[PDB]
Design a protein around this nucleic acid. Structure first.
Ligand SMILES: Nc1ncnc2c1ncn2[C@H]1CC[C@@H](COP(=O)(O)OP(=O)(O)OP(=O)(O)O)O1
Ligand SMILES: OC[C@H]1O[C@@](CO)(O[C@H]2O[C@H](CO)[C@@H](O)[C@H](O)[C@H]2O)[C@@H](O)[C@@H]1O
Ligand SMILES: [Mg+2]
Ligand SMILES: [Mg+2]
Lengths: 556, 411
DNA sequence: TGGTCGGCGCCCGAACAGGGACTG
DNA sequence: CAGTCCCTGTTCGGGCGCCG
């Protein structure tokens, strides 16, 4: 009985027919070796680590890095080869807690388990596979071989085992204290009660005793008796919260890696700072080779970055969640497929903010993008608060009614009201349901040669108007669009158009207001200027009317 | 202390690994209460992360129920167990169930909790319960008994089920009983009152073997939706062009359709609104066509090996059309639904109701659930569908975006 | 020095799916 | 009647941000 047993362990098999890691250690610099040897020798006295005779034929590299904002060192094991051969787990960490989720509490304590991984026993049979060899100041001294007796850092089963073990320990305390709120994230514990401050500290120490029984130690150094608490990168005050300050690089010359940090910082910032825009800054990253390559900022990404910094200038804060009051999400259109939103309960006191900028589809409109933002906000809300906010949307009720009733896809927005904050979202044009009496009828078609990439686009009309245009470096699809563009260019304010192109009719019937294709944009530009457009489809090669005549012209 | 039938996955197939999706506060509260009682009764027990399999869980309320029902999305597990339930213990399908004037559906899922489950199989029934705002990590469970919604539960319990049924069946030979997953379909030709009474008899019969259900179907009322051609006193060029396009598409289904005499009417290059008188040849060609569309397609018959496919079209004004088939253009049934719940206010609720109704008809007619081609965007459906779901099974679906060039199914 | 693990978010590009139209 | 080519949309893994 050389090593004692503490808390219930988790059986951990290897992947079938596979064996423990063997790989030689790193040429570690002696400066790092000083820190590692001191800490590692200490482990054996506790029982966290054990010596092994060469009967253990396993070697895995080892390294270390300083704990941020501390003198202490972190002991990591590059278990990349052991992970590959270790059984798969199911992660129990399903997301990140958000402060906007928190309800107001009279007394808040944040406490941190010490050596959290090293306090949880590894599986007894699995302990052998940990084996690694320590290094010395010279290559003369061999160094001892060690096997972990507890969860180690760098393995792939460590987080899930710790989180599940921690939850099992906490569950009896939370059953005895139903009215205490414990947010458990890894080893960080947030404890909140409406108990008066003296009574609350009684429960806090009583909880510390409960964790102590299983060998979990909460040092005073990481204890947080007094606000503002530091938790999950936020600063928690009694009635408000905010992100811990974010430093944005000042570089005069920007590389590729530079922009990534910038973008990723601004995404973190946009959860509370309203109106952050990353569109033009991200435009700089598309289709680039080297992470090291230097890139100059366009006057678009520069202007953007300028106002982005100025938004950060003023301090902003979020509030907490009041289950009694409604949740409200308001969305604004920011241009160039960019949308921002605010979730609040009392007007002008935001719980959180955010942006939806994703460009989805080659052809789209503002109504679809607004629907996407509503869905993204809805799921985000269900995670944080477990309910859907009421929506305030910059789209007239009749606009939305016209879109969803006529669209061929099922589409829906949950309970919402119109807010008259411009720019309003609208449909730029409407296709007629019936043919227009007294409007010229344009029969349009186009064809192209797969090999030469040459083609023709043209129309014929009931009044006798005709056109054929030669085109170079095109496709059948592109000439079918071109034919429609020609009819729109050459027609009056009301026009009937008959095509046999399912491709073109499908794009145009969805009422797009923006397109990646410049040709579609020009078609859109023309559709907006018309008073009435009726588009109709007929099957090709059926000997129909004008369609047969124009097909002969463009085929030539 | 009952023997546990061993179960295995289809060869070469690992267990389900499907992330749990976010749940509303009401559903999480319902699940926590349901799972606490199930753990106390030994039906489920908590498990660690060492189990690498997960299946999504959520809660529903059946029509008019008001009481939460736990529902596990076992579709991934069921496909992985697919050979076992159909090949080994599968239930024969009563061709007569669709003919009965009244069919009631009963939730017998609770019975499955009696039997225990193969210890080696329980690792695959794992499900995680999420927490609001991720206050806690996921609380994982696994099943110790036969789970509701798994396709092995009705098969393993079929031996037990028939013995319980057998006294009732002999007492009423005419009545037809079919079992699909958690459901018992009970079809009689009796008058309404006698039928409801006989269901109570089968309820007590289930009660003394260790559940009230009120969902009534009338498969004889069920009708189909023929392709229909407009009747017009006068026809414009646009009308004839629409008609020719519809008939040409229809000719992929009924090969006897002819458009020649109707095409003759659109020889020129004419304005769309110009009125065109019909010739006698076109009137007769249109007449012969309308007759053909009343007829059935030649050689369309159900094939038990092949999967059912369901397609749905949104026609507007609360109207939806569907086709069930196995081969393209060989439609086993075609229908229309109108004035469903959420009509004129909610497409997603209406589409959800439609999927449920279509699946129910397929269970009654063929004992299968179809794979749905849904006219909706993937993200729109996934956000909302669980909010409107009132059934204990879940069909397979995929998402399509077909803009409608011609209104073949509706008018 | 360069180097580990799990979770979530964004934006990217590449690889893959599949539906029509047209070519033999 | 296959086999392409267009064109579109999805998925998945990469980089970064953030949390232990
Ligand atoms: N860079 C990293 N790599 C691998 N695992 C990491 C990690 N950073 C954190 N973890 C894992 C390892 C365990 C946990 C780390 O949390 P603490 O920073 O608080 O270190 P703790 O062990 O608790 O010692 P204490 O500070 O209390 O004295 O998350
Ligand atoms: O809606 C698609 C979503 O399906 C998931 C998650 O539940 O899979 C379930 O639905 C699929 C489509 O019917 C089934 O094929 C699958 O077996 C079932 O688990 C997703 O992984 C998928 O993205
Ligand atoms: Mg700690
Ligand atoms: Mg043509």
């Amino acid at each position: 009985m050389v090593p004692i047993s503490p808390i219930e362990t988790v059986p951990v098999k290897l992947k079938p027919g596979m064996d423990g890691p063997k790989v030689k250690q790193w040429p570690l610099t002696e400066e790092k070796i000083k820190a590692l040897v001191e800490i590692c020798t200490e482990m054996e006295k506790e029982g966290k680590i054990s010596k092994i005779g060469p009967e253990n034929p396993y070697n895995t590299p080892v390294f270390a890095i300083k704990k941020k904002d501390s003198t202490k060192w972190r002991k990591l094991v590059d278990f990349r080869e052991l992970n590959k051969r270790t059984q798969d787990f199911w992660e129990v960490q399903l997301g990140i807690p958000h402060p906007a989720g928190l309800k107001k509490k009279k007394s808040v304590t944040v406490l941190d388990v010490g050596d959290a991984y090293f306090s949880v026993p590894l599986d007894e049979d699995f302990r052998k596979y940990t084996a690694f060899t320590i290094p010395s100041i010279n290559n003369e001294t061999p160094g001892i071989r060690y096997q972990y007796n507890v969860l180690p850092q760098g393995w792939k089963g460590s987080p899930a085992i710790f989180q599940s073990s921690m939850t099992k320990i906490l569950e009896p305390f939370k059953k005895q204290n139903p009215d205490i709120v414990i947010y458990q994230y890894m080893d960080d514990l947030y404890v909140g009660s409406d108990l008066e401050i003296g009574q609350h500290r009684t429960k806090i120490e009583e909880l510390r005793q409960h964790l102590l029984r299983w060998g979990l130690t909460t040092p005073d150094k990481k204890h947080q008796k007094e606000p503002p608490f530091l938790w999950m990168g936020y600063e928690l005050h009694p009635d408000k919260w905010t992100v811990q300050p974010i430093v944005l690089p000042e570089k005069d010359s920007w590389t590729v890696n530079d922009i990534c940090k910038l973008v990723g910082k601004l995404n973190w910032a946009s959860q509370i700072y309203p109106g952050i825009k990353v569109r033009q800054l991200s435009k700089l990253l598309r289709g680039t080779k080297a992470l090291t390559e230097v890139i100059p900022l366009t006057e678009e990404a520069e202007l953007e970055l300028a106002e982005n910094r100025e938004i950060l200038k003023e301090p902003v804060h979020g509030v907490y969640y009041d289950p009694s009051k409604d949740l409200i999400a308001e969305i604004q259109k920011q241009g160039q497929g960019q949308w921002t939103y605010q979730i609040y309960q009392e007007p002008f006191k935001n719980l959180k903010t955010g942006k939806y900028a994703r460009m989805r589809g080659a052809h789209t409109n503002d109504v679809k993008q607004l629907t996407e933002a509503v869905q993204k906000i809805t799921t985000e809300s269900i995670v944080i608060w477990g309910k859907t906010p009421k929506f305030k949307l910059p789209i007239q009720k009749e606009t939305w009614e016209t879109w969803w009733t006529e669209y061929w896809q099922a589409t829906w927005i949950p309970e919402w009201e119109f807010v008259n904050t411009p720019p309003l979202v609208k449909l730029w044009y409407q296709l007629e349901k019936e043919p227009i009496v007294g409007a010229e009828t344009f029969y349009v078609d186009g064809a192209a040669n797969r090999e030469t990439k040459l083609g023709k686009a043209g129309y014929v009309t009931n009044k006798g108007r005709q056109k054929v245009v030669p085109l170079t470096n095109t496709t059948n699809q592109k000439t079918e669009l071109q034919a429609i563009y020609l009819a729109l260019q050459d027609s009056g304010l009301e026009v009937n158009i008959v095509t046999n192109s399912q491709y073109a009719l499908g794009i145009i019937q969805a009422q797009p207001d923006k397109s990646e294709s410049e040709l579609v944009n020009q078609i859109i530009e023309q559709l907006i200027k018309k008073e009435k457009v009726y588009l109709a489809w007929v099957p090709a090669h059926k000997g129909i009317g004008g369609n047969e005549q124009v097909d002969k012209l463009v085929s030539a | 202390p009952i023997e546990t039938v061993p179960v295995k996955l289809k060869p070469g197939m690992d267990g389900p690994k499907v992330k749990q999706w976010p749940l509303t506060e009401e559903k999480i509260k319902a699940l926590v209460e349901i799972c606490t009682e199930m753990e106390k009764e030994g039906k489920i027990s908590k498990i660690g992360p060492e189990n690498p399999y997960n299946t999504p869980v959520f809660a529903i309320k059946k029509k008019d129920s008001t009481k939460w029902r736990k529902l596990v999305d076992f579709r991934e597990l069921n496909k992985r167990t697919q050979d076992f339930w159909e090949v080994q213990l599968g239930i024969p399908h009563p061709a007569g169930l669709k003919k009965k004037k009244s069919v009631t559906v009963l939730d017998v899922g609770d019975a499955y909790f009696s039997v225990p489950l193969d210890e080696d199989f329980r690792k695959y029934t794992a499900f995680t319960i999420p927490s609001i705002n991720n206050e806690t990590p996921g609380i994982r469970y696994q099943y110790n008994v036969l789970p509701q919604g798994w396709k092995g539960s009705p098969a393993i319990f079929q031996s037990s089920m028939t013995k319980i049924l057998e006294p009732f069946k002999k007492q009423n030979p005419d009545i037809v009983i079919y079992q699909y997953m958690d459901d018992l379909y009970v079809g009689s030709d009796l008058e309404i009152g006698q039928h409801r009474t006989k269901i109570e008899e089968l309820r007590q019969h289930l009660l003394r073997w260790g559940l009230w259900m009120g969902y009534e179907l009338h498969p004889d009322k069920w009708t189909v939706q023929p392709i229909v051609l407009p009747e017009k006193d006068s026809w414009t060029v646009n009308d004839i062009q629409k008609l020719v396009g519809k008939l040409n598409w229809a000719s992929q289904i009924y090969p006897g359709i002819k458009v020649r005499q109707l095409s003759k009417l659109l020889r020129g290059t004419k304005a769309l609104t110009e009125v065109i008188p019909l010739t006698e040849e076109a009137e007769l060609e249109l007449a012969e066509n309308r007759e053909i569309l009343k007829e059935p397609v030649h050689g369309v018959y159900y094939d038990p090996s092949k999967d059912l496919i369901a397609e749905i079209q949104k026609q507007g004004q609360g109207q939806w059309t569907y086709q069930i088939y196995q081969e393209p253009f060989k439609n086993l049934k075609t229908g229309k639904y109108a004035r469903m719940r959420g009509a004129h206010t909610n497409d997603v609720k209406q589409l959800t109701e439609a999927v449920q109704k279509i699946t129910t008809e397929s269970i009654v007619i063929w004992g299968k659930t179809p794979k749905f081609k849904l006219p909706i965007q993937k993200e729109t459906w996934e956000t909302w569908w669980t909010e409107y779901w009132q059934a204990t099974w879940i069909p397979e679906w995929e998402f399509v975006n077909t803009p409608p060039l011609v209104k073949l199914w509706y008018q």
